[PDB]
Amino acid sequence: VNSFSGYLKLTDNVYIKNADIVEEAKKVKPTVVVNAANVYLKHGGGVAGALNKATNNAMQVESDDYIATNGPLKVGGSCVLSGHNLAKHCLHVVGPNVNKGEDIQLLKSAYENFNQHEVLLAPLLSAGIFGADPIHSLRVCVDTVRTNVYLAVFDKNLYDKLVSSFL
Ligand SMILES: O=C(Cc1ccc(-n2cccn2)cc1)OC[C@@H]1CCCNC1=O
């Protein structure tokens, strides 16, 4: 039993809710919140900008030190950093950004990072300003993640479309 509330169960291990991932993280304080990161951990907009804003820019400060030490992530890769006031840990995962021409096949590799964590609160990777089809992202999530994932979808219209079209 965990504290996630109001989710629709899609599969044995994948759950979905129309929710603001920031507000959801603040309420649940999950062990792991996933950020929709880029390789530079520049949290300017989308989910990343919103999560970083909620940390009063502490996420960005920590991220800049991480990059200065380690260099950029790979597309499809991840790193574990602090969850600040939102979660114990933040798993920064880089899905391919279609508006940069990145290969969508890398979306499966991106979701594989979730399997290193037993339970996660997450957005749909490569959705939103990353330019991929969220229906495709949900399919890859379900077919790749084996650990327990609680997906937060900000847009109610998109949420309803994702549920109604889910196979
Ligand atoms: O960026 C996102 C994710 C997102 C993904 C897809 C869409 N989308 C709309 C139409 C088509 N796709 C919109 C948003 O979350 C925004 C965050 C989360 C909550 C806190 N404040 C924010 O701004």
From Swiss-Prot:
Changing S164L: In strain: Gamma/P.1. It is found in: Host endoplasmic reticulum membrane. Inhibited in vitro by GRL-0617. Residues 1-167 form the Macro domain. It catalyses: Thiol-dependent hydrolysis of ester, thioester, amide, peptide and isopeptide bonds formed by the C-terminal Gly of ubiquitin (a 76-residue protein attached to proteins as an intracellular targeting signal). It is a multi-pass membrane protein. Responsible for the cleavages located at the N-terminus of the replicase polyprotein. Participates together with nsp4 in the assembly of virally-induced cytoplasmic double-membrane vesicles necessary for viral replication. Antagonizes innate immune induction of type I interferon by blocking the phosphorylation, dimerization and subsequent nuclear translocation of host IRF3. Also prevents host NF-kappa-B signaling. In addition, PL-PRO possesses a deubiquitinating/deISGylating activity and processes both 'Lys-48'- and 'Lys-63'-linked polyubiquitin chains from cellular substrates. May form homohexamers. Interacts with N protein. This is Papain-like protease nsp3. It comes from Severe acute respiratory syndrome coronavirus 2.
